[model samples]
Target: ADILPANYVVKDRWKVLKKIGGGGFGEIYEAMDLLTRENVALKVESAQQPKQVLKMEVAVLKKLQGKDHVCRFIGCGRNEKFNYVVMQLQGRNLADLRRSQPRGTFTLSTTLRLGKQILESIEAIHSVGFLHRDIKPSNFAMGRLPSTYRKCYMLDFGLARQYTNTTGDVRPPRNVAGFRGTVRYASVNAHKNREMGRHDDLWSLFYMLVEFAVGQLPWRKIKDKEQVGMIKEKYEHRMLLKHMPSEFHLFLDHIASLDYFTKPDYQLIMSVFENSMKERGIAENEAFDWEK
Candidate 1:
């Protein structure tokens, strides 16, 4: 059932079309902007009154607007009882696309192609001086419209944080903050309750690529956070690189070499995948394996 009936409207302009999604604290709907003649996604959260929502996602996305790999932020507002945000709609996330494959795995060539674009997306996020504490397959998605089918967009910045202070000084490490991201893809440092840096995000990206290529990580079955963290620690992040092509190992080595505050050479990291793809005779094409 739709959270809002078809004819219901928000701010007397956006007419609810159907309920499309739900989140931890709100419901997402597809709606039509009557005056603009545009379709958009509306995220609504109920509060005691019509106070504006200071959403981290809204702020991060505003900063990321105009980036090719980011979803466009349309606008945000509040009604007498709900606070809402509006944005462009995107298609399936990588995790959803991977699920339809045999054993939920992508081919090596497909993995590299998708991986490179995802890295570019991450690079953009980092370039804006924010750390995406949660970097996973589900957070990276394909655009829905024909003009954007070839493009991938990064989503869900609810857990994002600025790594640098207002004066451009790097934030010092937090040694005791409780766990803040998904256990399966978190960096070892994050699991240890240490402060997260750009390197940690890259490490999470590495884990995501391993999952896409290998179907699952060795610790996928572990349910306890401590146990999973232990497993990741026991293996020292290198065991999973086994049987993967040389570039996979190279990616790990590159991440392992980075420090908390040091900036990553995005071009160099991207070239690792590019070189591996070329060496394996994989063309620089935009075709996705899921479409095959």
Candidate 2:
């Protein structure tokens, strides 16, 4: 079967409303939970597909359940034609929100506030030993209601994998791990096909923060992965930090010093953002650009 038609009911509970978004791997639909009469997101994957992205995402979400800055997991099931998972519906992603801004960027106050929450989300995933290989604006969305609009939630965990075994031992790096994230924001180590660790996620977060502050990265126009990696490697840090607060430079330095197995000091990293915000008189409760 193709994409589920509107009004199609799944398991006689979730009734499909309309297609919201998705790609080759699966399709996300705005659905209604007949039992509770609430709207929910239904992500469906073809049962015949070789790679089980939805299955992996369901497992990762389950592992990360009850964590802050994560979407609330509902349930999942499989049938003859497709597999699907139901989840809390969120608003537009950060990328789309950024694009909607007149300056195509966020003010320092907004960027710092959002950055802190996004970092917390990444930290939550790390605390559970999973690495969110894909760290980009499009993968994080704001909550649906005013009470939660200020909250940022991480999404699209299909690329997530544990960095440690069940016993909590750090896994050894593979000889040549394949490339595993978006080139524009991937860590230098990811470009080199190195096994990513906690630090790598922070590296991607750094790039995202830079874009949020500066409107775009220097390599934003570059499509070639190798070229982007080369520029990211050689680009002067001072230039990138020129438009951002000084704390970002320190954050980048900390990420640079991390080895494949090194544990990142998440508290220390967040402290920098906190200090900068305090010094600049930006309150955590201040209005975001979108809210303004």
Candidate 3:
């Protein structure tokens, strides 16, 4: 939206097609990378707060390079009007895909597979010394192309922050940094304005997975931030289960058991899903609901 019109070219290469999506920060466009003859997502934001976010995202994506589940960063450049980031194009996000389901929810088998991919992405993000403060369905999308159709990718590092200093020492948790992410998916600790760490991200993921499996969160209708926060605080993760299975409770409990900044045992969390599949007699499959 930053004065980029269709057919407009950036740095004499990427040709803007049209706006794909955007937020208060800026707009994203479907563009052609003439140099590579490939479609790429070009995000242009005002050369202000959003610019800083874009730069941070570039740095984070670079650090997250070689991690297949995270979006690949092409490069970035700026004009006087805005700064832009070029990233690999992706397909519909989990939020849209979930909403398109017959009951607006994924089956247990699909949920299990999706949850595994999301957790692996989070694990990659954390291993890089950063935290995706906002973890939700909308921020995770799948590859649009046939080659990548089987994979999921993590997006949006605008709210990301380093949990460790340059020396790789884990930063001590604090009580500040209040109210940082989507209220519906935020952890109880995040609601209290306490510093978020690996555990907080996992909490949000559990809530997201439940919503995907059940269509809605208990607090989805609560408009007041404090009220939603209270719901998350007061209710056991078990309370969120509907069509969801008990394996979800094990997932939530494991996250709750972790100390701040502790490295999550990704395999153990994934095993919860593995066991759920066994209980349901569901074998691992590559077909996504949308594909079928």
Candidate 4:
């Protein structure tokens, strides 16, 4: 009955490998099936409220099944005490990778590859009418490095929700308001008590790729909300991300021009990403596979 006991068993199907991670709501363990000897990730509620998180996970994950670059889901089970899910284990959470890397460490191709994978994942998830409300570094995994691949996968949909239908639901017009994800990496509106959406993620995408490469956000310490405002003040002169390349200036300019009111063209944003990669001295061959 203990939801967080160290040596918890699940549905009697798998044995615990070790405790890999967890956040505010639950615990994730690397579990192994006694029958198949296969390793998988098991998520169990940290409290009795597993049902609520289950609802959110099912809503988003049911829609995410078969999603390329996504974690493979086996099934979920629930009882009076807790609910849990089985998924393929992927190595290297983006947050850990960022933190462990030397500052300003991502090579040009690596940065573009990261951006492309995130965009592809976002584009696919959005096409399904669910918003990845918590689209930060911790929610991603590396696509390549040890492998000849370049693809980013969005993980941990515990907070994902459905507002519309398969036609790409953004939920109640604004999927997020009042700081859904971590603050340092949040979009301008996400910082300003405004509801965020697909466009907001796109904007955050630009910033996210920068940090994925540069190891820090330019706006992290600009404590004065007024100075940064809700329109990407980091772009006013130059931000921490700019040191990567001069070509990205126009890209930042485009994202900075958008606010809570102005509609953003996602295609243009993608275009700028493509343009900047070429300008960064990354050979066409070395560009992340996702770019092609």
Clashes of 4: 3
Winning candidate number (lDDT): 2
Backbone clash pairs in model 2 (N, Cα, C under 3 Å; residues 3+ apart or in different chains), count? 0
Instruction: Please identify model 2 stretches exceeding 4 Å from their true place.
Output: none
Q: Each prediction's TM-score against the native? A: 0.91, 0.97, 0.94, 0.80
Q: lDDT by residue for model 2 over 194-237, one digit each (tens)? A: 89989999999999988998899999999899999899889886
Q: Is candidate 1 or 3 superior in lDDT?
A: 3
Which residue pairs come into collision in candidate 1? none
Tell how far residue 252 is off in model 2, in angstroms: 0.9
lDDT of 1 by residue, 143-255 (tens): 88879887888867767888888887788877676767889998888888878889899999888888988999988988888999988877856778775777667778878
Two-way lDDT contest, 2 vs 4, winner: 2
Root-mean-square deviation per candidate: 2.6, 1.2, 1.7, 4.4
Comparison by lDDT, 2 against 3, better one: 2
Per-prediction tally of clashes = 0, 0, 0, 3
Question: Model 3, stretches more than 4 Å misplaced?
Answer: none
The digit string of per-residue lDDT tens for model 4 on 12-112 reads 87677787876667778888876677787787874365346855775566677877768777778878777788876776766776666557456667777
Please report how far candidate 2 places residue 287 from its true position, in Å.
0.7
lDDT of 3: 0.85
Ranked candidates (lDDT, high to low): 2, 3, 1, 4
